[PDB]
Design an enzyme around this catalytic site. Sequence first.
Site, PDB file in Angstrom:
ATOM      1  N   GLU A  69       3.091  -2.898  12.903  1.00 20.77           N
ATOM      2  CA  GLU A  69       2.256  -2.708  12.348  1.00 20.77           C
ATOM      3  C   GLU A  69       1.173  -3.224  13.348  1.00 20.77           C
ATOM      4  OE1 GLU A  69       2.709  -2.561   9.722  1.00 20.77           O
ATOM      5  OE2 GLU A  69       4.550  -2.826   8.637  1.00 20.77           O
ATOM      6  N   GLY A 112       0.435  -1.119  -0.176  1.00 18.80           N
ATOM      7  CA  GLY A 112      -0.008  -0.358  -0.244  1.00 18.80           C
ATOM      8  C   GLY A 112       0.924   1.276  -0.044  1.00 18.80           C
ATOM      9  N   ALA A 113       1.554   1.088   1.001  1.00 17.80           N
ATOM     10  CA  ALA A 113       2.876   2.336   0.855  1.00 17.80           C
ATOM     11  C   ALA A 113       4.025   2.283   2.007  1.00 17.80           C
ATOM     12  CB  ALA A 113       2.225   3.237   1.440  1.00 17.80           C
ATOM     13  N   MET A 114       4.820   2.700   2.486  1.00 20.07           N
ATOM     14  CA  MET A 114       5.928   2.451   2.928  1.00 20.07           C
ATOM     15  C   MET A 114       6.853   3.672   4.112  1.00 20.07           C
ATOM     16  SD  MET A 114       8.652  -0.216   3.906  1.00 20.07           S
ATOM     17  CE  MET A 114       9.211   0.999   5.425  1.00 20.07           C
ATOM     18  N   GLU A 174       0.521   5.480   8.178  1.00 15.58           N
ATOM     19  CA  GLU A 174       2.676   5.409   7.438  1.00 15.58           C
ATOM     20  C   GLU A 174       3.230   6.281   8.574  1.00 15.58           C
ATOM     21  OE1 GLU A 174       3.415   3.835   5.323  1.00 15.58           O
ATOM     22  OE2 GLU A 174       2.305   2.622   5.007  1.00 15.58           O
TER      23      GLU A 174
HETATM   24 ZN   LIG Z   1       2.373  -0.709   8.733  1.00 22.33          ZN
END
Ligand SMILES: [Zn+2]
Lengths: 892, 892
Positions: B344, B285-287, B322
């Site tokens: 996470e 999805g994103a980083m 994020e």
């Molecule tokens: Zn994450």
Amino acid sequence: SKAWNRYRLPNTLKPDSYRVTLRPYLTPNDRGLYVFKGSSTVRFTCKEATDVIIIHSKKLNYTLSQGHRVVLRGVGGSQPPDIDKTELVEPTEYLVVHLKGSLVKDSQYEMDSEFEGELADDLAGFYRSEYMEGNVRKVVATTQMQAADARKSFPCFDEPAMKAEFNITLIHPKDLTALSNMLPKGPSTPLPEDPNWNVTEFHTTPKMSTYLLAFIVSEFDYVEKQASNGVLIRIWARPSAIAAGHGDYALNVTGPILNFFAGHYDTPYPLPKSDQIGLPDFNAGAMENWGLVTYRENSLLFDPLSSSSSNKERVVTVIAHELAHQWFGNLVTIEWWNDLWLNEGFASYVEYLGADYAEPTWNLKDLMVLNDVYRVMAVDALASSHPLSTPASEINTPAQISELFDAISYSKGASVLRMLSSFLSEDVFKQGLASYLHTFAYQNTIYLNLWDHLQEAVNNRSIQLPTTVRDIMNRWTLQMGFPVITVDTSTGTLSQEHFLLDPDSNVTRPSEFNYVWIVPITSIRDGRQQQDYWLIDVRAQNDLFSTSGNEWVLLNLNVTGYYRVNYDEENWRKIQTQLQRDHSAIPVINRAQIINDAFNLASAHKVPVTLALNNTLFLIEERQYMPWEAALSSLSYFKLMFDRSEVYGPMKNYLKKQVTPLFIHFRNNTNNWREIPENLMDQYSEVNAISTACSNGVPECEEMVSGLFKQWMENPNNNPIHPNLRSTVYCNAIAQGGEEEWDFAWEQFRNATLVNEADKLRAALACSKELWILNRYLSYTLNPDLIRKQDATSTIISITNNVIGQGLVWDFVQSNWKKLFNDSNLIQAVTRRFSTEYELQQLEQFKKDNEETGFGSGTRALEQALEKTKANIKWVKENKEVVLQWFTENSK
Amino acid sequence: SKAWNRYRLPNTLKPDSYRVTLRPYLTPNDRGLYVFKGSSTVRFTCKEATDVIIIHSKKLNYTLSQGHRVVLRGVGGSQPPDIDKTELVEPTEYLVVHLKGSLVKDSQYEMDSEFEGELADDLAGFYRSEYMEGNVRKVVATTQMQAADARKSFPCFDEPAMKAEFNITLIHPKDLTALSNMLPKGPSTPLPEDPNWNVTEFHTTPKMSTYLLAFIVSEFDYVEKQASNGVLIRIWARPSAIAAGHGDYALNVTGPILNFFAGHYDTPYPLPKSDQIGLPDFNAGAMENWGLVTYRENSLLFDPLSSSSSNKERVVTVIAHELAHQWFGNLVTIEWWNDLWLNEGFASYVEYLGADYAEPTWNLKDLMVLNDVYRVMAVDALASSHPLSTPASEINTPAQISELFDAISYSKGASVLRMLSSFLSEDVFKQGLASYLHTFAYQNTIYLNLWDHLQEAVNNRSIQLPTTVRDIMNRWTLQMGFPVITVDTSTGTLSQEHFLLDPDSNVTRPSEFNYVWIVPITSIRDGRQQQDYWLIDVRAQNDLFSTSGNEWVLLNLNVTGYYRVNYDEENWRKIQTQLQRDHSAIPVINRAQIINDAFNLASAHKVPVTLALNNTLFLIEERQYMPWEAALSSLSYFKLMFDRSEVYGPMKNYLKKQVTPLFIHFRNNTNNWREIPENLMDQYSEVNAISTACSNGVPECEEMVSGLFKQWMENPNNNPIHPNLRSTVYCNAIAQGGEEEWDFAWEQFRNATLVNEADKLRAALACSKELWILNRYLSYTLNPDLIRKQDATSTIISITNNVIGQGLVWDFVQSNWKKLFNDSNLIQAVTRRFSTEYELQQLEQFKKDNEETGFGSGTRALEQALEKTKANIKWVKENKEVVLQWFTENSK
Ligand SMILES: [Zn+2]
Ligand SMILES: *[C@@H]1O[C@H](CO)[C@@H](O[C@@H]2O[C@H](CO)[C@@H](O[C@@H]3O[C@H](CO)[C@@H](O)[C@H](O)[C@@H]3O)[C@H](O)[C@H]2NC(C)=O)[C@H](O)[C@H]1NC(C)=O
Ligand SMILES: *[C@@H]1O[C@H](CO)[C@@H](O[C@@H]2O[C@H](CO)[C@@H](O[C@@H]3O[C@H](CO)[C@@H](O)[C@H](O)[C@@H]3O)[C@H](O)[C@H]2NC(C)=O)[C@H](O)[C@H]1NC(C)=O
Ligand SMILES: *[C@@H]1O[C@H](CO)[C@@H](O)[C@H](O)[C@H]1NC(C)=O
Ligand SMILES: *[C@@H]1O[C@H](CO)[C@@H](O)[C@H](O)[C@H]1NC(C)=O
Ligand SMILES: *[C@@H]1O[C@H](CO)[C@@H](O)[C@H](O)[C@H]1NC(C)=O
Ligand SMILES: *[C@@H]1O[C@H](CO)[C@@H](O)[C@H](O)[C@H]1NC(C)=O
Ligand SMILES: *[C@@H]1O[C@H](CO)[C@@H](O)[C@H](O)[C@H]1NC(C)=O
Ligand SMILES: *[C@@H]1O[C@H](CO)[C@@H](O)[C@H](O)[C@H]1NC(C)=O
Ligand SMILES: *[C@@H]1O[C@H](CO)[C@@H](O)[C@H](O)[C@H]1NC(C)=O
Ligand SMILES: *[C@@H]1O[C@H](CO)[C@@H](O)[C@H](O)[C@H]1NC(C)=O
Ligand SMILES: *[C@@H]1O[C@H](CO)[C@@H](O)[C@H](O)[C@H]1NC(C)=O
Ligand SMILES: *[C@@H]1O[C@H](CO)[C@@H](O)[C@H](O)[C@H]1NC(C)=O
Ligand SMILES: *[C@@H]1O[C@H](CO)[C@@H](O)[C@H](O)[C@H]1NC(C)=O
Ligand SMILES: *[C@@H]1O[C@H](CO)[C@@H](O)[C@H](O)[C@H]1NC(C)=O
Ligand SMILES: [Zn+2]
């Protein structure tokens, strides 16, 4: 190495005559079983001294008499040894009577037995069929002996060359009619132990094979008429069908066909009557039992107000087929099953002569090209096909026998006879056949006996042939397959080679003839028939086959010969030019030929696939049934290969384009579907135009079928769909609809009174596009309360033909094989889509997993499926891109 | 037994800092390859004498310097041994420098390298992303390091506890912007050898993990705003998106969320800027790269005129996620991947706090019950699940690491934190978290470090708990699964047991806690909240859980606790009575709970399936999103089990009945689809009503979607469908239509300018009911010119979710595994329908056939698929008849 462990009977004993008494019990016993009890005496001659009596027996239980399963007595002073013991040997289906000494050569003996078996719902031997009249269960005792089930009703030497006379007595409820091959001998008498039962003895049969005996107990009604040859014809069926007049068409045609055959072959029918009877439960189409011909209801009965013209054609052709067998099979009988075509090839060809006699305006003889020649060429182009006459030593078990009731024995048999008639002339042919029938009446034949009699006729008429009938016809009978004849019109050279759909396939069966044929070649040049030619060698040259300028030639006028034809590209191009200019200049059967041959040649890598596809372009203005049917038959392969792929849209788009003008022509000509065409072929053409238009997305067709079906749903007792159109309207309305249409059709099916109507609905229900509905329907096919056992495999096949039913049925077959088998057409149908390594590996694993269970009468079909699957993988790889491009570029 | 053949780095060497220069080449070379060249120096400390330097290196080619792959130099007077030789050890991804002597303990050294790698389109390491601006190809150099790909861009000690400072220089075309974690250090200067290139050095990073580095070269544009905490926010994207205003929503929310988190946790964001950048090609999805957060375009950009409310919610939640990581992951980092949930689980929970701050009218925190708790309970009820904190010694390879980026680490992580917040109170929780963040800033943690700081807060506030935070939370962290709490309201007894969907499954992972939990239990009696309770034992009694007369109780108010609840039948009956009388008397989240728990309990044989189905009866008058979504989520299992069976019609009939009044309510309330509801949950409820009505055959819905889609086809540039409705209208119009609708949607997809619109079309195309169209579409998913590699598996999964795509995709996966693998979500999706022995045998054979190839990060998913398939076979056998009867009897 013991005789009782070998499948063929010894040659030591040969029966003379039998008496048999059978008593079916049409209500279940305390154990819920329907049973029959019987007795028999067989009188036989010892041909070679032996200390064992080996006789067939299947699923029979013996009542002990004088200390053993049977009693052995002398005849004419003979003095047989005492019986030591008996055994039942199940694999070879024998009762084995071990004697304390040897019988004497050229002496007679009698053996008495008393026995009981199950009157099962298994469609084999003496079995039960059931129907309802309102809420009342009617149970019928009936028979099917062919090939090897007479032994399931009484002990007998159950091989077709063991001919004997039979003296049959049936003991039955006094209210029910008993029928057999012959008429009753004197009056029926009450059974002394119980006067609720009658004892009915029948006159002695002619000398005949065990597989032709029939015993039926029912309360059927009949209509009757003495035929012009003095033979009594009766049509028997359930009382409601007879009262409704549904036996009337059979009565109209049966006697006249029987008389026609008797006249045509100069050989009287020898029995006093020929009963035709329709059973609610019956495995095959019909069975030619001598004097008592049995049929599925859908092959005998006919309703002028609800049955289609196709149904009517089925009735007259099946009747003609069964009547043909009275000569080819009953009077003269195959020596052994390996030569089955002597029965089935003849009946399959001669049926058209009989049907044409009864219905001279229909032109049916032509349909043999589609129904016989092209039907069988599909399988006969495989390395795993088999000769018309397989060596007798290879055919031993009931499974191996059953396997021969196939397209080769029936349709190739008929095709080779069609060819023979053509090159001899029909007059010479029938002269040789009359001689054959006269000589071998009440006896048995092999293929050589036929050639000898045809030769006698050829010799009498001074017909000159390139060699003897035997040497020409042995090429077509003793080796599998057929040639492709390739013409080079530049030079007039012809050559032949064994036609194989897969060039890479491995022909392992040697031929003493080297897969070379002697080929009668007819031909036309620019529409005019040329002199006939005989191709005797692998290659030859003749100016008959040379062209110059604009001229074209075509070989095999009206496809009388059992072979395919290829040409040089230039002649093919001239043929295509002719099709565009005036397609009527080529005989209709040869328009079918051009299409069908080119598609097959393309599979074999002998022409580009685009050449075969280009041959279909003219169909947009073709109105005849046959060329369209030949195209649709060949394109069925494309559908099987491509209907799960990107190629399928463009393929459907192409067919939609090609059929639309024809569909519109019929819409107009029928006054918007109010009428049907007068000519039978035009009626078939109309059905194909509708089917094709709807399957390929013509919007006017989808609207029409959905509208008609909805109108029927709103008025169930007033069906607005003409019988000819019902199969296709039902199928496409179900495909276009949902659960509501399906459920309506299922209730119509369950409540059906006519087998013809039930059959159309049963096929239509397999047209659902919804996987869950197909799965539910699959579960019904296996339930004998919902779908009759006789129709289970047929319905499963209909499901597998649906693209959404493919994975469903194949997974089901893999999962349930042991259960299905233990408790051929199926294998062929479920595997025909296979075109991937994944599917091939599944098929190979299926073979491995079930090797022990065995595949019985489906063994050859599995070998053929493996060969075809391998060819299909390669064919798809080689053709998918070119075919995609062709359909895309030609569909606009 | 050699250190270079072991997956974890030795503890002998620990890096201090690095400089890295990287130069991507954004045009292909003579060999057609995109490459990057680089250099690096790492300064490190020897912690224990050793004669080998083992450092990570993946797919890098080294330029020799002074006779070896690297140069080793002293620091602060150290005198390192000469290099003997180097080797690249591919399995463990090491460069191994063998030395002629040993390094000295507590001394520093530097190692210099010069290297080259491929700038591949593989979404890992330093890689390329591509897009078109008109006809001009734009190529972007970008990065993704997590987990173990920093080593694919430069040699490094690539484990998260090896923190270091990084000094990055990018050499790039002078026209393109270079971006990294930090701001540029001084001006960019021309490269001396070639002034068409700029050299851009960046300021030193904080001490940080290698997996958080980012290097990007592009011609993106940006919008910018200084946040209220003084941090510069820039939103970077392709120039057309920025000019169109599609970065504006991200700019509206990013700085305010960042400031909110800094305030909430009393812990400043320490860097001068936080760039958000959207890449055309991106795996996840994103980083959360520190200072340079990367996103898929669909997670960052937003078009108010074409993106849905669901898309808007995705943007704010992913941004919040994020940003949460800047604290939970970047500032404080996991010691090793086995404890991934510390990153996470926190980001997955804390994202809702941030999103709720930015959008206080949306009520998103509630959706955690669906998106986290129920999402993960499906897999966490298997014997083959895994603890939140797996033992560190089990997690060694990149595949094993990758596997942990799963529902357990994210969603169970979030759920357990939700529970913890509830029993501590949020104020106490955040106090402990502030202490945790302060103490471990720029360091690494394990789960015990978190408990210690939460305990400090509990101790300061005199919160009394039944034991320490550690002992309560270790039960939820160190063993897999969760309890079902069963209440007997007759006596007020409660008990707990490990909840397993299959009672027969084999739990092989031992727990030192014996699968007993310490459980915080909230409850209501007749809608009124009771005193809280702690269940510490397997069973207990308390009058809180005893009822008499008409009273009911429910446990787990608003599902704050990670557990399921069962009751005696009498309490269940009172709950059902309440649902019929006035369902509003039960909190909305608990209406979702009652439904979801009962369906799962039914699978586990703890309640009759009819009890779970009876709990859905009240949905006919439910207007709230959440209980419907919980029901549809549970019934998804019924669809997977039954959509190829007779049960499916009645199931659809039942759903049609239940949803019709809701569908009609929305038709009226929206003034015939002209408007959308004001409240976000009502907007989601509307979409579900439409989706459900159309999938289950509501005729007004089918008419509506087909009509709208046809209107769009007639006016392609004037889309009449509100963005919220597009996914479902597109999917159902394609399902109801044919080739023409599909082709229209495919061309719209190919021509798409917005990722949001492309995504909806790409999913919709998988809704075709035509097998040939699904097969063709399957062939496109694998073509990177048609569907971006980042979206291949997603699209394949969409196909397999279609009942007609099931056999297609499973056969494809079995056939192409080696090719797919060598050149997890997929396994889970393709196997979830399996409910037959046939499918089980295929799955077992698939495991056997590919054991050598291995299953990498899909290994656990395969074990889970085997366990679920076995449970499914038994569940279908046990439930199919009762379920068929229930849907039939309740759908009328
Ligand atoms: Zn994450
Ligand atoms: C089935 O029924 C037929 C017809 O009734 C039986 O044929 C008849 O059999 C008798 C007794 O064998 C024959 O008479 C005898 O002929 C022999 C010569 O083989 C002679 O030596 C005796 O003096 C005696 O006359 C009779 O000719 C014959 N009738 C016909 C028309 O062939 C047959 O035996 C029955 N078979 C069984 C097994 O019941
Ligand atoms: C990455 O860049 C940073 C910042 O420029 C570098 O840190 C700096 O490194 C120098 C040289 O080691 C440090 O000065 C030295 O300190 C040592 C004590 O370790 C002392 O003995 C020497 O007399 C000398 O003054 C300097 O303090 C340091 N600056 C900061 C802000 O930490 C770092 O070396 C770079 N790393 C690499 C691998 O390029
Ligand atoms: C024949 O005998 C077998 C073995 O006793 C028995 O199972 C079977 O039911 C019998 N068949 C009939 C029709 O009685
Ligand atoms: C039964 O036998 C009687 C004489 O006993 C006869 O009149 C009657 O027709 C017979 N019926 C049938 C159906 O065989
Ligand atoms: C049978 O023939 C009669 C007399 O020709 C005819 O009226 C009748 O229609 C025919 N029946 C059928 C079913 O074709
Ligand atoms: C051939 O002619 C002979 C002598 O005239 C005749 O007896 C015989 O029946 C004929 N055979 C055939 C098959 O015509
Ligand atoms: C099929 O027809 C096309 C179009 O006229 C022609 O170009 C092509 O050569 C034909 N294919 C063959 C094999 O002759
Ligand atoms: C079923 O067939 C019967 C008898 O032929 C007929 O009377 C009736 O109309 C049919 N039933 C239904 C429900 O259509
Ligand atoms: C690295 O070297 C290998 C082996 O010579 C070569 O195949 C590969 O293309 C090189 N990679 C790059 C990016 O140059
Ligand atoms: C490139 O360097 C020049 C100075 O040499 C500078 O003015 C320019 O802004 C730089 N551009 C980029 C995109 O880095
Ligand atoms: C961003 O905020 C501004 C100012 O409140 C507002 O006008 C605009 O609509 C917002 N943009 C988006 C895309 O929501
Ligand atoms: C607990 O209180 C001590 C003493 O006042 C304080 O220094 C410490 O920061 C507090 N810790 C937490 C987690 O609140
Ligand atoms: C489901 O409801 C039906 C109808 O009210 C009831 O008969 C049945 O007992 C219920 N099922 C259970 C498990 O309580
Ligand atoms: C494709 O998108 C372009 C550019 O956004 C637009 O101008 C055009 O209308 C679209 N093309 C078609 C064929 O609809
Ligand atoms: Zn026949």
